[PDB]
Design an enzyme around this catalytic site. Structure first.
Site, PDB file in Angstrom:
ATOM      1  N   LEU A  17      70.966  61.637  40.202  1.00  0.00           N
ATOM      2  CA  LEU A  17      71.411  60.871  41.366  1.00  0.00           C
ATOM      3  C   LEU A  17      70.468  61.053  42.513  1.00  0.00           C
ATOM      4  CD1 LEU A  17      75.319  61.406  41.075  1.00  0.00           C
ATOM      5  CD2 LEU A  17      73.901  59.689  40.216  1.00  0.00           C
TER       6      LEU A  17
ATOM      7  N   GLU B  69      83.600  63.035  44.959  1.00  0.00           N
ATOM      8  CA  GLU B  69      83.192  61.691  44.464  1.00  0.00           C
ATOM      9  C   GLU B  69      83.119  61.715  42.942  1.00  0.00           C
ATOM     10  OE1 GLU B  69      82.036  57.938  43.810  1.00  0.00           O
ATOM     11  OE2 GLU B  69      80.653  59.541  43.137  1.00  0.00           O
TER      12      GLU B  69
HETATM   13  N1  LIG Z   1      74.945  56.374  40.957  1.00  0.00           N
HETATM   14  C1  LIG Z   1      75.564  56.008  39.846  1.00  0.00           C
HETATM   15  O1  LIG Z   1      76.743  55.579  39.909  1.00  0.00           O
HETATM   16  C2  LIG Z   1      74.815  56.011  38.560  1.00  0.00           C
HETATM   17  C3  LIG Z   1      73.547  56.514  38.479  1.00  0.00           C
HETATM   18  N2  LIG Z   1      72.881  56.394  37.326  1.00  0.00           N
HETATM   19  C4  LIG Z   1      71.431  56.809  37.329  1.00  0.00           C
HETATM   20  O2  LIG Z   1      70.669  55.776  36.874  1.00  0.00           O
HETATM   21  C5  LIG Z   1      69.549  56.332  36.043  1.00  0.00           C
HETATM   22  C6  LIG Z   1      69.777  55.826  34.555  1.00  0.00           C
HETATM   23  O3  LIG Z   1      69.853  54.353  34.533  1.00  0.00           O
HETATM   24  P1  LIG Z   1      68.792  53.418  34.066  1.00  0.00           P
HETATM   25  O4  LIG Z   1      67.444  54.012  34.304  1.00  0.00           O
HETATM   26  O5  LIG Z   1      69.122  52.113  34.559  1.00  0.00           O
HETATM   27  O6  LIG Z   1      68.960  53.474  32.475  1.00  0.00           O
HETATM   28  P2  LIG Z   1      70.147  53.087  31.399  1.00  0.00           P
HETATM   29  O7  LIG Z   1      71.141  54.078  31.463  1.00  0.00           O
HETATM   30  O8  LIG Z   1      70.491  51.716  31.522  1.00  0.00           O
HETATM   31  O9  LIG Z   1      69.321  53.327  30.033  1.00  0.00           O
HETATM   32  C7  LIG Z   1      68.328  52.383  29.649  1.00  0.00           C
HETATM   33  C8  LIG Z   1      68.179  52.537  28.130  1.00  0.00           C
HETATM   34  O10 LIG Z   1      69.473  52.144  27.583  1.00  0.00           O
HETATM   35  C9  LIG Z   1      69.344  51.199  26.463  1.00  0.00           C
HETATM   36  N3  LIG Z   1      69.933  49.941  26.961  1.00  0.00           N
HETATM   37  C10 LIG Z   1      70.280  49.622  28.254  1.00  0.00           C
HETATM   38  N4  LIG Z   1      70.991  48.488  28.199  1.00  0.00           N
HETATM   39  C11 LIG Z   1      71.086  48.110  26.891  1.00  0.00           C
HETATM   40  C12 LIG Z   1      71.705  47.032  26.313  1.00  0.00           C
HETATM   41  N5  LIG Z   1      72.364  46.093  27.041  1.00  0.00           N
HETATM   42  N6  LIG Z   1      71.703  46.962  24.941  1.00  0.00           N
HETATM   43  C13 LIG Z   1      71.057  47.930  24.239  1.00  0.00           C
HETATM   44  N7  LIG Z   1      70.423  48.997  24.806  1.00  0.00           N
HETATM   45  C14 LIG Z   1      70.454  49.049  26.148  1.00  0.00           C
HETATM   46  C15 LIG Z   1      67.891  51.198  26.266  1.00  0.00           C
HETATM   47  O11 LIG Z   1      67.628  52.102  25.278  1.00  0.00           O
HETATM   48  P3  LIG Z   1      66.581  51.839  24.049  1.00  0.00           P
HETATM   49  O12 LIG Z   1      65.235  51.778  24.625  1.00  0.00           O
HETATM   50  O13 LIG Z   1      66.819  53.006  23.210  1.00  0.00           O
HETATM   51  O14 LIG Z   1      66.971  50.504  23.392  1.00  0.00           O
HETATM   52  C16 LIG Z   1      67.269  51.423  27.597  1.00  0.00           C
HETATM   53  O15 LIG Z   1      65.896  51.860  27.516  1.00  0.00           O
HETATM   54  C17 LIG Z   1      69.615  57.797  36.146  1.00  0.00           C
HETATM   55  O16 LIG Z   1      68.921  58.194  37.371  1.00  0.00           O
HETATM   56  C18 LIG Z   1      71.107  58.076  36.454  1.00  0.00           C
HETATM   57  O17 LIG Z   1      71.335  59.291  37.145  1.00  0.00           O
HETATM   58  C19 LIG Z   1      73.406  55.886  36.169  1.00  0.00           C
HETATM   59  C20 LIG Z   1      74.703  55.450  36.210  1.00  0.00           C
HETATM   60  C21 LIG Z   1      75.472  55.461  37.439  1.00  0.00           C
HETATM   61  N1  LIG Z   2      81.355  56.430  41.542  1.00  0.00           N
HETATM   62  C1  LIG Z   2      80.535  56.894  40.586  1.00  0.00           C
HETATM   63  N2  LIG Z   2      80.228  56.154  39.534  1.00  0.00           N
HETATM   64  C2  LIG Z   2      79.429  56.743  38.584  1.00  0.00           C
HETATM   65  S1  LIG Z   2      79.023  55.933  37.184  1.00  0.00           S
HETATM   66  C3  LIG Z   2      78.215  57.360  36.553  1.00  0.00           C
HETATM   67  C4  LIG Z   2      77.644  57.317  35.246  1.00  0.00           C
HETATM   68  C5  LIG Z   2      76.978  58.528  34.889  1.00  0.00           C
HETATM   69  C6  LIG Z   2      76.903  59.589  35.799  1.00  0.00           C
HETATM   70  C7  LIG Z   2      77.433  59.562  37.072  1.00  0.00           C
HETATM   71  C8  LIG Z   2      77.250  60.742  37.956  1.00  0.00           C
HETATM   72  N3  LIG Z   2      76.914  61.982  37.175  1.00  0.00           N
HETATM   73  C9  LIG Z   2      77.858  62.783  36.690  1.00  0.00           C
HETATM   74  C10 LIG Z   2      77.496  64.060  36.192  1.00  0.00           C
HETATM   75  C11 LIG Z   2      78.433  64.980  35.688  1.00  0.00           C
HETATM   76  C12 LIG Z   2      79.762  64.605  35.657  1.00  0.00           C
HETATM   77  C13 LIG Z   2      80.145  63.354  36.165  1.00  0.00           C
HETATM   78  C14 LIG Z   2      79.213  62.416  36.701  1.00  0.00           C
HETATM   79  C15 LIG Z   2      81.593  63.208  36.076  1.00  0.00           C
HETATM   80  N4  LIG Z   2      82.005  64.483  35.434  1.00  0.00           N
HETATM   81  C16 LIG Z   2      83.460  64.776  35.278  1.00  0.00           C
HETATM   82  C17 LIG Z   2      84.154  65.379  36.429  1.00  0.00           C
HETATM   83  C18 LIG Z   2      83.426  66.423  37.303  1.00  0.00           C
HETATM   84  C19 LIG Z   2      83.514  67.755  36.494  1.00  0.00           C
HETATM   85  O1  LIG Z   2      84.487  67.833  35.702  1.00  0.00           O
HETATM   86  O2  LIG Z   2      82.661  68.670  36.711  1.00  0.00           O
HETATM   87  C20 LIG Z   2      84.218  63.959  34.280  1.00  0.00           C
HETATM   88  O3  LIG Z   2      84.132  62.715  34.473  1.00  0.00           O
HETATM   89  O4  LIG Z   2      84.917  64.460  33.376  1.00  0.00           O
HETATM   90  C21 LIG Z   2      80.945  65.249  35.259  1.00  0.00           C
HETATM   91  O5  LIG Z   2      81.064  66.442  34.917  1.00  0.00           O
HETATM   92  C22 LIG Z   2      78.167  58.377  37.487  1.00  0.00           C
HETATM   93  C23 LIG Z   2      78.913  58.082  38.653  1.00  0.00           C
HETATM   94  C24 LIG Z   2      79.127  58.676  39.885  1.00  0.00           C
HETATM   95  O6  LIG Z   2      78.614  59.831  40.319  1.00  0.00           O
HETATM   96  N5  LIG Z   2      79.986  58.125  40.788  1.00  0.00           N
END
Ligand SMILES: NC(=O)C1=CN([C@@H]2O[C@H](COP(=O)(O)OP(=O)(O)OC[C@H]3O[C@@H](n4cnc5c(N)ncnc54)[C@H](OP(=O)(O)O)[C@@H]3O)[C@@H](O)[C@H]2O)C=CC1
Ligand SMILES: Nc1nc2sc3cccc(CNc4ccc5c(c4)CN([C@@H](CCC(=O)O)C(=O)O)C5=O)c3c2c(=O)[nH]1
Length: 186
Positions: A22, A30
């Protein structure tokens, strides 16, 4: 199967990730919000399904994988089987959602939660149909290398209330944030 939903936490500059984690330091309440939303199912004898890309899966510390109490599905075209600790693997979002109605999952799955990353959020957000977005607004800029797609407010309505979502400003580690729920049906 019940509702389709996305959940994300996003900075002011639309950032969601940096270097595989993140952009901001851990906001423990959160994270607990994310767990509550994604795990809580109103439907008896069902659990919710989480759908995530491969990098998002590996961004969750291995200790906390799979996300407990949820069915964990990873999207990848390169993997040949689910990663250790994951439950399912699909090659497209369309495939994953179709899987939720095969015999295996049909009466097991309540809500479906798309938990990122950017490309799956973008494709879901333009998937025709009824969809909600649970967005945490991190009210600061944070250097990021992964971004949330545009929310088209001509289809996504910001809801003026939602049961169980706090409406006031939150603050952890000196970082103010607020919870929002959006809904479209097209
Ligand atoms: N703030 C938040 O709420 C969140 C933060 N994050 C952050 O975002 C980053 C990760 O996200 P991001 O980089 O976008 O990567 P993704 O998690 O989307 O992973 C991308 C990989 O997933 C596979 N992929 C993605 N979409 C598809 C699809 N529709 N069908 C098949 N395969 C798919 C591919 O793998 P392959 O090449 O093997 O086909 C691709 O290379 C990290 O920094 C993480 O911490 C992630 C979620 C939530
Ligand atoms: N609003 C929001 N959307 C997304 S979508 C998304 C997709 C992937 C990752 C994240 C943030 N990274 C994480 C890393 C570790 C944990 C969690 C989240 C939740 N987790 C527990 C509870 C906490 C615990 O039990 O210690 C559990 O879920 O069971 C973890 O242990 C978010 C993420 C986000 O941070 N916030």
């Amino acid at each position: 199967v019940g509702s389709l939903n996305c959940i994300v936490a996003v900075s002011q500059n639309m950032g969601i990730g940096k270097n595989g984690d993140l952009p901001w330091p851990p906001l423990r309440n959160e994270f607990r919000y994310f767990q509550r939303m994604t795990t809580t199912s109103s439907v008896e004898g069902k659990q919710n399904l989480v759908i995530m890309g491969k990098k998002t899966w590996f961004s969750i510390p291995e200790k906390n994988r799979p996300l407990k109490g949820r069915i964990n599905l990873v999207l990848s075209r390169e993997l040949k089987e689910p990663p250790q600790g994951a439950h399912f693997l699909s090659r497209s979002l369309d495939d994953a959602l179709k899987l939720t109605e095969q015999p295996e999952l049909a009466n097991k799955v309540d809500m479906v939660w798309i938990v990122g990353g950017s490309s799956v959020y973008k494709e879901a957000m333009n998937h025709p149909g009824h969809l909600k977005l649970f967005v945490t607004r991190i009210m600061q800029d944070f250097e990021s290398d992964t971004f949330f797609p545009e929310i088209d407010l001509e289809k996504y309505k910001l809801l003026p209330e939602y049961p169980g979502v706090l409406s006031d400003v939150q603050e952890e580690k000196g970082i103010k944030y607020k919870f929002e729920v959006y809904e479209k049906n097209d």
